[PDB]
Structure 1
Amino acid sequence: ELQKLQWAKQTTSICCYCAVGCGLIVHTAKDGQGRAVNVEGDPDHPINEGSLCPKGASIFQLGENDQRGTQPLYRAPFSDTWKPVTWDFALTEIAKRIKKTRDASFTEKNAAGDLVNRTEAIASFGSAAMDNEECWAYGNILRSLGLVYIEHQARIXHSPTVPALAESFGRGAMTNHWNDLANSDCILIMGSNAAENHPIAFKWVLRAKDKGATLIHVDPRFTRTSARCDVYAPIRSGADIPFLGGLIKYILDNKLYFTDYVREYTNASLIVGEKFSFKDGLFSGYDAANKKYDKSMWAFELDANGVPKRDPALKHPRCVINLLKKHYERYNLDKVAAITGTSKEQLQQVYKAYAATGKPDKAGTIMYAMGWTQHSVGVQNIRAMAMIQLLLGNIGVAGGGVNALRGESNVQGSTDQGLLAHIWPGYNPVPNSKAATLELYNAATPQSKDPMSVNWWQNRPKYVASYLKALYPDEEPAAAYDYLPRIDAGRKLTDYFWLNIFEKMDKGEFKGLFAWGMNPACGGANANKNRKAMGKLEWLVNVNLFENETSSFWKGPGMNPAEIGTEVFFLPCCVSIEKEGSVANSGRWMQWRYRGPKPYAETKPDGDIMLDMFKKVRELYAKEGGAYPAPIAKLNIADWEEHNEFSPTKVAKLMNGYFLKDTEVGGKQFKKGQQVPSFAFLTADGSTCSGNWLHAGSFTDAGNLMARRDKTQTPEQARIGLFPNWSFCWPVNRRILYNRASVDKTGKPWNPAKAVIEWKDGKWVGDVVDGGGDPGTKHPFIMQTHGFGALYGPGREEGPFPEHYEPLECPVSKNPFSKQLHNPVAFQIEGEKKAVADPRYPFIGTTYRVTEHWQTGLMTRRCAWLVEAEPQIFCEISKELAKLRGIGNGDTVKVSSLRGALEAVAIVTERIRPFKIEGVDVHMVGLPWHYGWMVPKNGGDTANLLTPSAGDPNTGIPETKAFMVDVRKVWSHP
């Protein structure tokens, strides 16, 4: 056998980088007692089959890295030095600062005198990089301390996708899964670099092509994805809506929609109120003064029973499908070409190819991510594509869907666990101030009187009650509800989000920050604002693998440590392979992973760090009292622990949930202490606890379903690779969502050759059906109020149809579609100037990734094989732009915006070409944002020195993908 592996124990794990969720084999020396000796792919894993991209293939170099933190370090105010300290010192002092800050900043009641019970002066950032059990424990810890400013990666990543797809379909999640790409007949990759950023996905994309699919990449750059597609079309950054509205128009004009699917399954028939109009950029109900829409102007006309009226002939002028045809009739080839840079020929070619999946037995799929989300119009970009998919019958089918590609390993899961300011675990809203009782909270939920509309959210009362009974089990739901903090009902939700946290930090309003597995000194847009802002904190707790640009902002570029009063605690955490837990992939596959080696040096898993820190805070409250100590004293944390350690297994069981009492539910009978087998059998009365309802099914009486490694399939399941016995996906192992739309009212597949489910005997066969009920008896979209795929979606801040607006910094003074240049209700901070068609910043700036690095490169900048492949910040420009600026391939260049400047090596390439925008060449400058001042030497700093703190009014995601810059040659050096 192999000398290297021989006397080493083998364990299975899941890649700690992207949301594909590839399987690892780990070898640990001396049957598990020594260090990792080897990490490589798990040949048995149904997603990667042993494959790893270079980030997965280098995990050994990350885990066995002698630059890793070894113990806590403390930076005294105005100090230029780290001091080594004990966990006992570090966690007692932090507990002290938490309490001191909580006591001095606690709001029992707001201005208006409503109850809110919230800590104003502490914020938390993180983290999508933690295991699902740690994320849920972490949120509950911070909420029990009264925090409302709780944010992570999701805010600045796929936040717009959740409302965009929820509005369209009922849920915000990726609709299909990685193995399902192979079933597609046309893969459109757009706002995505999937060969670089989801590399194992390309195994399945290429397998689609092997079985007859066309692969289309639409991107402002020619990339490693583009090299391997049949069709490449350029598009200018910030011009997706025109491209997609074009395609809506092309589909409607040429009768390429799936008629039966549109009539029965979309809100096509539903009649909108005479109140709805649209004129020269603005929907009806614009309040100019306050930058806000009166959404009530967009309501459907109700019948007599409070149900939206339907004309199933599609003749009424106020049918959605007729206002759709009217809204997108401006989006003609010549206007789209003129504003995208894309030629008429290329639109025609891509439109003809995609629109052809219209047929019932064809499936087209979109793979999108940050090229669409990181925009002032991000929600509307994703809405426009959701709409196209419904017109073409691609929602619910094998090889269809909206494949919103999630980023980090557990971003799907951290979001599920409510590490965002607007949501508790399971996407139940954070209460605002009007919701003074549980009844007033639960009564927010919209009702349907349509007997065919499941409107499944109506069960929210059960999930809220089970949630409070997981936290506070010796209490009534209604009494425990008062222990949890609330936001103000009069304030835009963007007030509670990433960009406004940093704006408030920059005015002195924050005393403490947890930077828990995030690097906002490099990851946050407008990095110079953030670096100065952190200097206004009294304390900062950085939990991470390595010293970094956040931990050490006080000794960054242009900083004098002696001027900066921030106390910093750096607490070193352990890598993925040194702990047990689950991570949820883009497909909602919740996968269990085991420990290989013991934690390195004095590093600790996050669960243990946060559990220790909370106990010391509870001890301080027991001993001295202070502000509202009840939430802190009463939080059930004894269910989180075993042999004096944090217990991921017992936290998973509690997130799945269990009966506190014997009970009868769904007319079925259950013992006390029994695991809730499904969210169906949860209750509003206190009979059941469940930390996260979406987890009810994950850990039943049959064992840990996330730990299943069973590739067994029926022949129908094998035809489209569901692998329903590999781990567990939410909800209740529904692998393809909205699968009711994949059949006719009989329950026969639209594509028998690629069937998701079929009515055969008296059973649904294939996937778990997405909603109970015989064929034809229910609307297929069970999380929607009205039960339909929304073509018209009136809950969105900018309006119920996508409309093109230029980025807040744009190369045009004038918008060809309307007199509204920018998004009329865009999130912006007064006094922050915007380079609009300014000669000083004449070029489009964009930021993106490479295959070989990860996020801010905090991790991969430490990994010598990945630095070897991509050693330093580069700048991609066309030959045309390089000629204009006298820039030679390999020259040093300085890229600048209103907000900052940095140097980079120029990559002059034909892979970037100028954009003919209204007859004028517009040049683009591309930067990767993986670089930072701390390491390596000569790597460069973060592209976020350039980016603006403005963005989407629905989610506050920054516009990191489209801004304005200059580039000049730099003449320095021997």
Structure 2
Amino acid sequence: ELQKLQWAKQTTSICCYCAVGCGLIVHTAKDGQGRAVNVEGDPDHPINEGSLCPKGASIFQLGENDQRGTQPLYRAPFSDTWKPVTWDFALTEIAKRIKKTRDASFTEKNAAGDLVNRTEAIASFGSAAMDNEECWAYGNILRSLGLVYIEHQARIXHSPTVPALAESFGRGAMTNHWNDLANSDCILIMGSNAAENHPIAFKWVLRAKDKGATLIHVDPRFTRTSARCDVYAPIRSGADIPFLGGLIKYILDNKLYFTDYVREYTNASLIVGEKFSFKDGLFSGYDAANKKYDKSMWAFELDANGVPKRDPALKHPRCVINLLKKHYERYNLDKVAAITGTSKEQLQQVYKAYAATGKPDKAGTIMYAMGWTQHSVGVQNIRAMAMIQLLLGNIGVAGGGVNALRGESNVQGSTDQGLLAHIWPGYNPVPNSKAATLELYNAATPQSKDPMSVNWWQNRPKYVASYLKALYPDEEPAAAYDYLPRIDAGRKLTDYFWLNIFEKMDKGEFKGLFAWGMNPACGGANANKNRKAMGKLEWLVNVNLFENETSSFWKGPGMNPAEIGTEVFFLPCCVSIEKEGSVANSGRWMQWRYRGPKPYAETKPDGDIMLDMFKKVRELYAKEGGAYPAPIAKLNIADWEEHNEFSPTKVAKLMNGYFLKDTEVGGKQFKKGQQVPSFAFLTADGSTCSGNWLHAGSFTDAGNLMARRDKTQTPEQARIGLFPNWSFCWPVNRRILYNRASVDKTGKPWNPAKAVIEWKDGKWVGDVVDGGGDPGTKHPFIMQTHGFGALYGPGREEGPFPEHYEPLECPVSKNPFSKQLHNPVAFQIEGEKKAVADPRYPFIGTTYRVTEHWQTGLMTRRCAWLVEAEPQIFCEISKELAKLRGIGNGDTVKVSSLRGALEAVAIVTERIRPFKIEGVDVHMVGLPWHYGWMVPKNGGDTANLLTPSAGDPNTGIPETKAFMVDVRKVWSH
């Protein structure tokens, strides 16, 4: 036997880094009682097959790191030093601060006299790094305390994907999964650097290519992804809608779209109202003064019976499809080439290659991430591609779909658990002030009088009611609905989001902040503003693995500890392999992982910290009372606990949900206590509880279906890699979403060789069908009100069709598409200057990742092997720029924006080349954002010193992918 692994116990885990969800094998000394001795890949895991990228392969060195936090630390106001304290001291004092701060800022009624029952002076950041059970629990705790300012990674990451794909398909999630890439005939990677950022994914990408697939990378840079691709085209940052709109024109103009699919499955036939217009960058209904659209002007013309009108012949001039052709006729290769920098030759080659998947027996997939999301036009970037997939019949089919690649291991799951201001778990909207009662709440949910339109959201009252029974099972849903806090109906949703939280914090309007498993002094755009704003807090509770730029902002660069009155509690948590729980990968795969080592030193799981913290808040409210203490007193935390510790199992079972009384649901008999077998069996009347209705099916009487490790498949399942018996995905194990669009009227696969479902012997076989019902009898997009794939998407803040707008800081002063240079309703903050074609910041700035580092680098800048490979911040520039600025490869340079400045080592490379934009060379400067002032020595500081606090009007995501900088040689040392 091997000396290293011999007396060690083997347990399985899932990777604590990216959303690929790679399987890990962990070996713990003294058959489990000592420290991890080894971590490597799980050879039996169906996604990674024992593979690990260098982040996964160095988890051992993360877990067994001596720089790890050992115990709680306290930083007194105006102190320059940490004081080691007890868990009892830290958590008792935090409860006193929570309580003091909540009592002084608790608003029962807003200005207008409406009920809101909310705390305005505390915000919470985090976290996609926590298990699903800790995420759910944390959000319920924060809301029982009446917080509305609840954000995490999702806001500044894939927030655009949710409304973008939900408008388009009804759901906001990744449409297929990782193993399904191997089934594609054309993989377009664009807004994504997947060989670096989702490495194990390239196993499946290259297997696609082995079996005939064309690989295309469109990116400002030549990357490690570009090297392993058949076609590489450059594109300028923030010029993706031109490209995609050019492709829409090309598909339509050459009749390369899938006619039958488009006619029956998309809203191509639906008739748009006479009020809808577009004229020189503005849609109908533009309020120039409020910088807001009147969406009423974009409604469909309705028949008498409430249903939107349809012309199946696609002839009516106000048919969605005829208005589509009209919108994108301006996107001719000459105009797209001038604005993207991408040659006509190259546009023609990519368009020809991708458009050929129009055929029914073909599937093109898109892999996209931050390159599309982190923009003022983020949502419209994604709609534009979502539209292209619908024209080509690529949604619902194997090797197709919209693979919006999730980042953090549980960002999917943390978004599921509603750790965002605008959503409760299960993506139920947080109630606004006009929703005075549970009836007025449910009255917002759109209704359909089309018999074929499933309109599944109509079931919401059951989920909302079951959720409220999950929190408060001894109270009527009507009564419990008054405990949870509300937002103002008057105000834009972005007033409750990340960027505005930091604007408020910087005007002294916040007293308290939970930085829970996040590092916003490096991760938040405009880091200088963020670092100053944290100074204006009374208290800060940082929960994390190591001391960091957030915890210790008070002794960061240009900071005098003695000027800063913030009280900071540093509370050290466990790593992933020290705790049991589930994490939701990009494929919605909810995977269960096991404890290897005992928690290091006096570190504690997040769940145990937040439960103990909450028990001290409740206990304090019992003793001395205060503002509206009901939601705190009555919150069901009994079901979160076993053996005086947080029980991830019990919480998973509650999130699945169970019966509170014996009841009859959907034509079946259920006995009190039984787990809810699926979300179809939840009730509005109060006989079912369920923390999250997407979880309804994950933990049945059968057992924990998330912890299933069964590679068994039917021959048709194995042909497209579904692995239905490996863990569990939402909803109800539908591995490929919208799979009803993968069959004709009669239920026959479009691509029989790669069938997702098929009607065979009065049953669907293959993947669980997404929408029950016999072939031809329903519309395949069951989460849509009208049941159709939306080419026209009238719910989106800047309009129903993507249109090109230059980034808020751009290199040109004129848009060749309209008089509207910028997004007409862009999220901006008053008096924050933007550099627009300014000779002081003449260069396009963008930020991005390398394979070896994770996020702000808080974790991996502590891992000697990852630092060894990528020791310092670098700046990627072209040979032509380096010539112009007298910068040699390896030279120190200063990169500056209007917001900040940093030094980096120049990497001069043909991998970046000038963009020819309107007959003028525009140079780009690229920076990684993985570095910060605390570790290592000479590592550098965050690129987010440079990035602007402005972004997408829908979701408030900042534009960290396109801004403007200068770069200059540094002559020092």
Provide the TM-score with structure 1 as the length reference. Answer: 1.00
Alpha-carbon distance in structure 2 between the residues aligned to 1:693 and 1:819: 46
SS for the counterpart of 1:309 is: coil
Q: Deviations over 1:247-274 (max 9, x none)?
A: 0000000000000000000000000000
Alpha-carbon distance in structure 2 between the residues aligned to 1:519 and 1:366: 30
Match of 1:331 in 2: 331
Alpha-carbon distance in structure 1 between the residues aligned to 2:425 and 2:878: 46
Q: CA deviation at 1:87?
A: 0.3
SS for the counterpart of 1:137 is: helix
Alpha-carbon distance in structure 2 between the residues aligned to 1:309 and 1:711: 47
Q: CA deviation at 1:690?
A: 0.2
Q: CA deviation at 1:433?
A: 0.2
Q: CA deviation at 1:143?
A: 0.1
Match of 2:428 in 1: 428
Q: CA deviation at 1:138?
A: 0.1
Q: Deviations over 1:586-611 (max 9, x none)?
A: 00000000000000000000000000
After TM superposition, the structure 1 = structure 2 runs for residues 873-952 of structure 1, keeping only pairs within 5 Å, are: 873-952=873-952
Match of 2:718 in 1: 718
SS for the counterpart of 1:4 is: coil
Alpha-carbon distance in structure 1 between the residues aligned to 2:351 and 2:281: 25
Alpha-carbon distance in structure 2 between the residues aligned to 1:834 and 1:141: 39
Q: Deviations over 1:834-853 (max 9, x none)?
A: 00000000000000000000
Q: Deviations over 1:103-126 (max 9, x none)?
A: 000000000110000000000000
Match of 2:127 in 1: 127
Q: CA deviation at 1:323?
A: 0.2
Q: CA deviation at 1:35?
A: 0.2
Q: CA deviation at 1:694?
A: 0.2
Q: CA deviation at 1:24?
A: 0.2
1:63 partnered with 2:69: no
Q: CA deviation at 1:173?
A: 0.1
SS for the counterpart of 1:189 is: strand
SS for the counterpart of 1:5 is: coil
1:255 partnered with 2:259: no
Alpha-carbon distance in structure 1 between the residues aligned to 2:31 and 2:645: 22
SS for the counterpart of 2:4 is: helix
SS for the counterpart of 1:482 is: coil
Alpha-carbon distance in structure 1 between the residues aligned to 2:424 and 2:151: 12
Q: CA deviation at 1:745?
A: 0.6
Alpha-carbon distance in structure 2 between the residues aligned to 1:29 and 1:834: 56
Alpha-carbon distance in structure 2 between the residues aligned to 1:540 and 1:160: 29
Alpha-carbon distance in structure 1 between the residues aligned to 2:831 and 2:287: 21
Q: Deviations over 1:903-952 (max 9, x none)?
A: 00000000000000000000000000000000000000000000000000
Alpha-carbon distance in structure 2 between the residues aligned to 1:669 and 1:397: 36
SS for the counterpart of 1:533 is: helix
Q: Deviations over 1:199-254 (max 9, x none)?
A: 00000000000000000000000000000000000000000000000000000000
Match of 1:548 in 2: 548
Alpha-carbon distance in structure 2 between the residues aligned to 1:466 and 1:647: 21
Match of 1:730 in 2: 730
Which stretches in structure 2 are left out of the alignment for 5+ residues? none
Q: CA deviation at 1:813?
A: 0.4
SS for the counterpart of 1:39 is: strand
SS for the counterpart of 2:810 is: coil
Q: Deviations over 1:718-773 (max 9, x none)?
A: 00000000000000000000000000010000000000000000110000000000
Alpha-carbon distance in structure 2 between the residues aligned to 1:748 and 1:289: 53
Q: Deviations over 1:120-152 (max 9, x none)?
A: 000000000000000000000000000000000
Q: CA deviation at 1:33?
A: 0.3
Match of 2:647 in 1: 647
Q: CA deviation at 1:188?
A: 0.1
SS for the counterpart of 1:803 is: coil
1:502 partnered with 2:502: yes
Alpha-carbon distance in structure 2 between the residues aligned to 1:39 and 1:420: 33
Alpha-carbon distance in structure 2 between the residues aligned to 1:93 and 1:33: 33
Alpha-carbon distance in structure 1 between the residues aligned to 2:836 and 2:408: 33
Q: CA deviation at 1:194?
A: 0.2
Match of 2:838 in 1: 838
Q: CA deviation at 1:805?
A: 0.1
Q: CA deviation at 1:514?
A: 0.1
After TM superposition, the structure 1 = structure 2 runs for residues 80-159 of structure 1, keeping only pairs within 5 Å, are: 80-159=80-159
Q: CA deviation at 1:955?
A: 0.2
SS for the counterpart of 1:700 is: coil
Match of 1:471 in 2: 471
SS for the counterpart of 1:706 is: coil
Alpha-carbon distance in structure 1 between the residues aligned to 2:620 and 2:104: 15
Q: CA deviation at 1:619?
A: 0.5
Q: CA deviation at 1:340?
A: 0.2
Alpha-carbon distance in structure 2 between the residues aligned to 1:749 and 1:667: 31
Match of 1:618 in 2: 618
Alpha-carbon distance in structure 1 between the residues aligned to 2:684 and 2:815: 51
Q: CA deviation at 1:195?
A: 0.1
Q: CA deviation at 1:374?
A: 0.0
Match of 1:790 in 2: 790
SS for the counterpart of 1:704 is: coil
Q: CA deviation at 1:963?
A: 0.1
Segments of 4+ moved more than 4 angstroms = none
After TM superposition, the structure 1 = structure 2 runs for residues 305-704 of structure 1, keeping only pairs within 5 Å, are: 305-704=305-704
Q: CA deviation at 1:520?
A: 0.1
Q: Deviations over 1:81-115 (max 9, x none)?
A: 00000000000000000000000000000001100
Q: CA deviation at 1:708?
A: 0.2
Which stretches in structure 1 are left out of the alignment for 5+ residues? none
Alpha-carbon distance in structure 1 between the residues aligned to 2:315 and 2:466: 46
Q: Deviations over 1:248-306 (max 9, x none)?
A: 00000000000000000000000000000000000000000000000000000000101
Q: CA deviation at 1:902?
A: 0.1
Q: CA RMSD in A?
A: 0.2
Q: CA deviation at 1:686?
A: 0.3
Q: CA deviation at 1:172?
A: 0.2
Alpha-carbon distance in structure 2 between the residues aligned to 1:249 and 1:80: 61
Alpha-carbon distance in structure 2 between the residues aligned to 1:377 and 1:399: 27
Q: Deviations over 1:469-490 (max 9, x none)?
A: 0100000011000000000001
Q: Deviations over 1:364-388 (max 9, x none)?
A: 0000000000000000000000000
Alpha-carbon distance in structure 2 between the residues aligned to 1:753 and 1:488: 52
Q: CA deviation at 1:821?
A: 0.2
Alpha-carbon distance in structure 2 between the residues aligned to 1:638 and 1:310: 53
Alpha-carbon distance in structure 2 between the residues aligned to 1:544 and 1:47: 29
Q: CA deviation at 1:778?
A: 0.1
Q: CA deviation at 1:392?
A: 0.1
Alpha-carbon distance in structure 1 between the residues aligned to 2:537 and 2:965: 31
Alpha-carbon distance in structure 1 between the residues aligned to 2:117 and 2:361: 55
Alpha-carbon distance in structure 1 between the residues aligned to 2:641 and 2:665: 30
Q: Deviations over 1:175-213 (max 9, x none)?
A: 000000000000000000000000000000000000000
Q: Deviations over 1:689-736 (max 9, x none)?
A: 000000000000001000000000000000000000000000000000
- What count of residue pairs does the alignment treat as equivalent? 973
Match of 2:197 in 1: 197
SS for the counterpart of 1:367 is: strand
Alpha-carbon distance in structure 2 between the residues aligned to 1:592 and 1:686: 29
Q: Deviations over 1:356-415 (max 9, x none)?
A: 000000000000000000000000000000000000000000000000000000000000
Alpha-carbon distance in structure 1 between the residues aligned to 2:872 and 2:317: 58
Q: CA deviation at 1:447?
A: 0.1
Alpha-carbon distance in structure 1 between the residues aligned to 2:68 and 2:454: 51
Q: CA deviation at 1:877?
A: 0.2
Alpha-carbon distance in structure 2 between the residues aligned to 1:388 and 1:636: 46
Alpha-carbon distance in structure 1 between the residues aligned to 2:434 and 2:673: 36
Alpha-carbon distance in structure 1 between the residues aligned to 2:6 and 2:633: 50
Q: Deviations over 1:836-884 (max 9, x none)?
A: 0000000000000000000000000000000000000000000000000
Alpha-carbon distance in structure 2 between the residues aligned to 1:114 and 1:481: 14
